[PDB]
């Protein structure tokens, strides 16, 4: 029993440790996702729902399976009730249940770490919410930032000394890429997006290409 679960835990951890790292932090305009991703078309950050965003680390097919399941959950609940009943807390909760089931019952555990974020609805005053779901269904409520994958202690500490609330978009971005480096890196090796509390309905936005370049400098 306990040996099986220690093995599953280790296989998973070693999976996530060997993955490229990801950071999502609260900033003045909402929440920022910055991910080490050289791919041209395969994405690790994603929209879940109107004000709810998603980012993961680990094995791509597994956390993409989870992203898709989450979009299914969100759209279904929004339809059967109302759009405004879909919340980040809910999706973190279902991811917790889903990953716990996966971790105890599936042939192999998912080598995955997940971050669900929510910003306020348009015109409302509400602190952004970050949640981290680890491979075994553990769920953590985080106030300022979330760090996932690779070697996290360096990046988390970098942020812990450089993170300041109400940061602007460029400041927050540079703090995030700086923390990532502690673990040369520009448009071609980054996937960036934001939950932008200023947009009226769909808050998820990718910042790519000329825009991202402009913001890095």
């Amino acid at each position: 029993m306990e040996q099986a679960m220690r093995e599953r835990s280790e296989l998973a951890r070693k999976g996530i440790a060997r993955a490229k790292s990801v950071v999502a932090l609260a900033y003045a305009g909402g929440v920022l996702f910055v991910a080490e991703n050289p791919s041209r078309s395969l994405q690790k950050i994603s929209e879940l729902y109107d004000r709810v965003g998603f980012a993961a680390a680990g094995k791509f097919n597994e956390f993409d399976n989870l992203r898709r399941g989450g979009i299914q959950f969100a759209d279904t609940r929004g339809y059967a009730y109302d759009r405004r009943d879909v919340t980040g807390r809910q999706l973190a909760n279902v991811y917790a249940q889903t990953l716990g089931t996966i971790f105890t019952e599936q042939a192999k555990p998912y080598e995955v770490e997940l971050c669900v974020a929510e910003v306020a609805h348009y015109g409302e005053t509400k602190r952004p919410e970050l949640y981290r779901i680890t491979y075994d269904g553990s769920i953590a409520d985080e106030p300022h930032f979330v760090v996932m994958g690779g070697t996290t202690e360096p990046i988390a500490n970098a942020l812990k000394e450089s993170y300041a609330e109400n940061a602007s978009l460029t400041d927050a971005l540079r703090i995030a890429v700086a923390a990532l480096r502690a673990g040369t890196l520009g448009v071609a090796s980054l996937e960036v997006a934001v939950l932008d509390a200023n947009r009226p309905r769909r808050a998820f936005r990718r910042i790519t290409g000329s825009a991202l370049q402009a913001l890095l400098v």
Binding site: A80, Y81, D82, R83, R84, D85, R89, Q90
Partner: protein, 222 residues
């Protein structure tokens, strides 16, 4: 049956008659057709007694089920969608005589203005719904008489009290022209039930007040 609902400054009121029939025969004098379905919501239901009550019961259990599972109550919009889905689910039975046709009165705790946050939602037997913008609405065999009354009396609604007066007098006109709607029974002491909902929640209106208003309308007409 007649169920009525109307918006007044800072709240809403809903009131329903007490009559049950089978054809021409009076089978009940004291049935309740208006239910507090949650802290900020009442549903009045016309149709088959058993299906109506079943709807009110199931609906209240459903809204509270969500609230206990998710830690927060459904938005008003969601509450509407769940009632509407229930009605649509019953259409097949409704075509065979087991009809439940509801009317929703709520107070939206999330709305901007705590004086215009009252909500009246009408439904049709397919589950189509509409949020009533003109201040009042009614359902049941007497609903046309009740609505044509409130059309004339609605300018008198200035507070909860006058709104309840117009609601009970609408129910009165309904009873005057529709035999499937019960009027105030002064001999037995049975009167329409009513709920009023404001920022402080939904509350049952004391019978004695409705009796007072009924006696005042009755005296007025004679």
């Amino acid at each position: 049956t007649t169920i009525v609902a109307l918006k007044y400054p800072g709240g809403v009121v809903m009131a329903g008659d007490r009559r049950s029939t089978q054809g021409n025969m009076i089978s009940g004098r004291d049935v309740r057709k208006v239910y507090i379905t949650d802290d900020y919501t009442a549903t009045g239901i016309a149709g088959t007694a058993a299906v109506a009550v079943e709807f009110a019961r199931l609906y209240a259990v459903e809204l509270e089920h969500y609230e206990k599972l998710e830690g927060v109550p459904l938005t008003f919009a969601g509450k509407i969608n769940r009632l509407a889905i229930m009605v649509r689910g019953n259409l097949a039975a409704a075509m065979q005589g087991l009809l439940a046709l509801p009317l929703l009165a709520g107070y939206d705790i999330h709305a901007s203005d705590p004086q215009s946050a009252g909500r009246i939602v009408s439904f049709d037997a397919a589950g189509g719904w509409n949020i009533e913008e003109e201040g009042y609405q009614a359902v049941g065999s007497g609903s046309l008489f009740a609505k044509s009354s409130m059309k004339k009396l609605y300018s008198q609604v200035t507070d909860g009290d006058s709104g309840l007066r117009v609601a009970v007098e609408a129910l009165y006109d309904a009873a005057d022209d529709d035999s499937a709607t019960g009027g105030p029974d002064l001999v037995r002491g049975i009167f329409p039930t009513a709920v009023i909902i404001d920022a402080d929640g939904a509350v049952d209106v004391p019978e004695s007040r409705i009796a007072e208003l009924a006696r005042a309308i009755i005296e007025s007409r004679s």
